[PDB]
RNA sequence: GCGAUGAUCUUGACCCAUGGGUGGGUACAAAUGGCAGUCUGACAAGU
């Protein structure tokens, strides 16, 4: 897919999925296309994530719209079979969200991931 | 009560006063709904035959919305922005922004849209069906001998790019377009050029390259904190 | 036996006027899509929505070559000259043919309510001449009519006091 | 010695560098056609037909050193057999930038106000040419056209009340029977008085046992008989109200290309009037797109979602899907799951349609989609 | 060359030293007018 932009390298894939999955341990984590498009409208995620193995992609193809409107950080990854992977899913998921928690002890490595994803954007 | 507008220290910059205090330009196609926004109508008293004195319309106008209102609200005196001048506006990156510049312009300005990407082209469109004073043109801006016939000659020109190289994408087009003694309007965004570094270091370098291709800079702020990280640059071009 | 029918023909008039207003605002917002020019410079609805029906094209709407300005209208007329004037000077929407066919079945629309507003309005004043010819030799015949509409008979209007 | 690269032709300037502000030849092109593939030929480097005519006419004392602008057009002018020394030094030249300042007062019949209505005019169709569409993305007539076809239900049903009630004088005995308008309409329309009865007209209309009623009951019914004026009214508003349902069919058969032809999944799934009335009361595809699937399952009765929520008390389960024929043939503690897949996969196939793939395409997928559905259809009412 | 076959008088409301300002009904158009932030979110079936 020449749409497929940003997208994540390996190292920084194993990063987040690691992310997501402690997000996943500690409940801070949004399924699907629908719960992170509410979590968009509610201003309440920290960043997306987004499957670019998925066939069809005009599924989601508004959510990089709608994330440059609200300022939300966002990667493609290039598996969706690791991204449900890492969400404890045994289903392909193509779209997570990361919700907000002030309180988290993970929040460093939020504040680091999304380090790295204003690094990618720009 | 009716609030009443009186302008500003420049032409077709208006500002309200008191209970409200917007920053309004003169309405030149009205019914539109840009972003949902509100209009104006105020009219001078006046008694004589046949229709009522005009309702001359004003369209509210925000700096959240517009770096340009800023720019005014921070406090100017000199622009090259005016009814009446020929403007070249590098990107418009939603085309909603493309009608305020066209209040602005007058009806007796030409708004030349550039646009180097498909889809906020379909928006610049259907701006342009409904006014007949904006020319939308989606060609690739860093070479202007590729869209030197379809446009004549500005009298001044507003840049809102922000790339690393924009130094380079203007220098062909002011070579190009712009007159001599012709004014610049450069708005400059700190953080989307480099963040990992100061802006200071940035803005010395930039206008290190504006003395380069020979502008300059008549005043250079930072706004005030209604945006951040950005300094816009008002300058003449061959002065 | 007029007592009631003229009721049903005066009220049905006032019908028939609210749904041309109705089909015209659209006609005058479709051909405002196309031609913005013509839109503007004729306010009426029978004849403007000839207008719209016979051409189609606001490239070839003249006086003459092709005529549409002086089968119902003159070419010595001020309007004609401002569609001449006004069709050198377009900027309008070029639109396919199947979208404006919609447009022409409402013109033939505007074209049949007119001619019924017209065939009951010649019923109307022939009726009432024939029914009450007193009362339309004093205060004519929409305001008698409509007055009887409000007594519902002429004898409910014969017992009012 | 120089080209003048412009939307009005191609001139050749010497003024006849020994330069007066004046012109040495020019070419001229005007036109839609002639400015479109001139717009093609600056974006290409194209060689335009003026330009080999310029290159053709004025030669061996104004063309030995020529200067153009482009490093594309100097190449081509290069392979010409006339043996032009072409270069493109000077480009960024005070002369060059000054051939524009005198392009009112160098072009005969021209002035600054056409070259901003041409130069406009061309925009527009260039950019229906680059953005391979309409100049609107027109897609809002649909919208007003669903609001008109229930006015005319509405006023179709008046003046079926109005004709039914001006009719009731002669005929009375004829609405507790015939209660159809159309059947209604057209038994006045082919008979017109009941003292005229035959047999046709009864047959193209009515079955035999609606017919031996409309028959006995015309033997019966006694009521008025006035002047043929009143009767030439009523064969007139029948022939109108005909007339008109005719004309609201023909708006469905308007609707029909208009609904294949832009949205063709939702045609596929819900066919016209649903999608129709999703579009109409979300407002635009676009924004509906960026509406997830719950609110498209909620797409309706503001009032009472929003009453449901304010009370905290149990929500509508029913939308716009209220009147799907598949959402209506389950029962209701079915539908309201096979609800959510179909409102589900619909938003699936508006993110097919909004995205400008397959309004080109004519869409495929959604006759998966609906394999998809009647799959799970079949098994949840096993 | 006046009328009970209605003569006669009154329900446009306020104010200012012909002129000028409010009040109400109809139609059209528009809503930084009303929408806590326009549903909850992974299990279900069978043996």
């Known amino acids: 897919n020449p749409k497929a932009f940003p997208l994540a390298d390996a190292a920084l894939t194993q990063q987040i999925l690691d992310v997501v999955q402690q997000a996943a341990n500690l409940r801070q984590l949004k399924k699907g296309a629908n719960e992170a498009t509410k979590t968009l409208n509610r201003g309440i995620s920290e960043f997306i994530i987004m499957a670019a193995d998925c066939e069809p992609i005009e599924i989601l193809l508004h959510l990089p719209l709608l994330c440059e409107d609200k300022n939300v950080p966002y990667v493609f990854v290039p598996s969706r079979v690791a991204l449900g992977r890492a969400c404890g899913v045994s289903r392909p998921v193509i779209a997570a969200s990361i919700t907000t928690n002030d309180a988290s002890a993970i929040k460093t490595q939020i504040y680091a991931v999304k380090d790295k994803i204003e690094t990618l954007l720009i | 009560a009716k609030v009443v507008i009186e302008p500003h220290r420049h032409a077709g910059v208006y500002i309200a006063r008191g209970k409200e205090d917007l920053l309004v330009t003169k309405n030149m196609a009205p019914g539109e709904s840009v972003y949902g926004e509100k209009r104006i109508s105020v009219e001078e008293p006046s008694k004589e035959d046949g229709v009522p004195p005009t309702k001359v319309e004003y369209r509210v106008w925000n700096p959240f919305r517009s770096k340009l209102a800023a720019g005014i609200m921070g406090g100017l005196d000199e622009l090259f922005i005016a009814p009446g001048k020929k403007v070249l506006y590098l990107g418009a990156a939603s085309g909603t922004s493309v009608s305020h510049v066209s209040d602005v312009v007058g009806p007796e300005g030409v708004v030349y849209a550039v646009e180097f990407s498909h889809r906020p082209g379909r928006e610049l469109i259907s701006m342009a069906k409904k006014r007949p004073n904006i020319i939308p043109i989606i060609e690739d801006a860093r070479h202007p001998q590729k869209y030197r016939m379809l446009i004549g000659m500005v009298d001044c020109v507003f840049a809102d790019v922000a790339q690393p190289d924009q130094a380079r994408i203007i220098a062909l087009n002011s070579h190009m377009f712009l007159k001599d003694q012709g004014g610049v309007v450069i708005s400059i965004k700190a953080n989307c050029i480099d963040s990992t570094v100061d802006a200071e270091t940035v803005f010395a370098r930039e206008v290190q390259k504006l003395r380069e291709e020979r502008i300059k800079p008549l005043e250079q702020l930072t706004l005030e904190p209604y945006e951040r990280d950005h300094c816009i640059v008002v300058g003449r071009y061959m002065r | ?161 | 010695y120089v080209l003048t690269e412009t939307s009005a032709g191609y001139a050749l300037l010497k003024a006849s560098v020994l330069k007066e502000f004046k012109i040495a030849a020019f070419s001229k092109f005007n036109s839609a056609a002639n400015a479109l593939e001139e717009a093609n030929s600056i974006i290409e480097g194209k060689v335009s037909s003026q330009l080999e005519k310029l290159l053709e006419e004025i030669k061996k004392d104004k063309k030995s050193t020529l200067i153009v602008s482009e490093t594309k057009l100097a190449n081509a002018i290069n392979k010409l057999g006339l043996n032009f020394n072409v270069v493109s030094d000077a480009v960024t030249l005070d002369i060059y930038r000054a051939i524009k300042e005198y392009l009112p007062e160098l072009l005969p019949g021209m002035s600054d106000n056409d070259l901003s209505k041409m130069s406009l005019g061309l925009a527009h169709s260039i950019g229906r040419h680059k953005l391979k569409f309409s100049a609107d993305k027109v897609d809002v007539m649909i919208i007003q056209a669903i609001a008109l076809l229930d006015d005319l239900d509405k006023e179709l049903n008046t003046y079926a009340m109005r004709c039914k009630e001006w009719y009731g004088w002669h005929f009375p005995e004829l609405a507790k029977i015939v209660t159809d308008s159309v059947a209604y309409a057209r038994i006045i329309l082919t008979m017109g008085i009941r003292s005229k009865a035959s047999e046709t007209d009864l047959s193209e209309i009515l079955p035999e046992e609606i017919e031996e009623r409309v028959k006995t009951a015309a033997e019966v019914s006694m009521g008025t008989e006035i002047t043929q004026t009143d009767l030439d009214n009523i064969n007139a508003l029948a022939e109108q109200i005909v007339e008109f349902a005719a004309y609201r069919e023909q708006l469905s058969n308007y609707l029909s290309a208009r609904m294949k032809a832009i949205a063709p999944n939702l045609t596929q799934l819900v066919g016209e009037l649903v999608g129709a009335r999703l579009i109409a009361h979300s407002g635009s595809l676009i924004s509906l797109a960026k509406s997830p699937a719950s609110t498209i399952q909620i797409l309706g009765a503001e009032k009472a979602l929003f009453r449901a929520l304010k009370t905290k008390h149990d929500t509508p389960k029913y939308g716009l899907l209220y009147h799907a024929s598949l959402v209506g043939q389950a029962t209701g503690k079915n539908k309201g799951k096979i609800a959510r897949v179909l409102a589900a996969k619909a938003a699936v196939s508006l993110r097919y349609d909004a995205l400008a793939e397959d309004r080109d395409d004519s869409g495929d997928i959604g006759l998966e989609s609906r394999a998809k559905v009647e799959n799970r259809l079949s098994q949840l009412e096993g």
């Open chain 3, 1 to 161: 036996k007029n007592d009631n029918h003229i009721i049903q023909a005066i009220a049905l008039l006032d019908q028939l006027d609210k749904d041309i207003n109705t089909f015209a605002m659209r006609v005058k917002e479709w051909y405002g899509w196309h031609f913005p020019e013509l839109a503007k410079l004729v306010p009426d609805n029978y004849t403007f929505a000839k207008l719209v029906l016979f051409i189609k094209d606001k490239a070839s709407l003249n006086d003459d070559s092709l005529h549409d300005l002086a089968a119902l209208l003159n070419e010595d007329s001020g309007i004609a000259q401002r569609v001449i004037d006004n069709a050198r000077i377009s900027m309008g929407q070029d639109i396919s043919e199947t979208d404006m066919e919609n447009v022409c079945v409402f013109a033939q629309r505007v074209a049949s309510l007119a001619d019924y507003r017209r065939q009951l309005y010649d019923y109307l004043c022939e009726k009432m001449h024939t029914v009450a010819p007193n009362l339309s030799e004093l205060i004519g015949e929409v305001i008698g009519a409509r007055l009887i509409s409000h007594a519902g008979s002429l004898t409910n209007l014969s017992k009012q006091a």
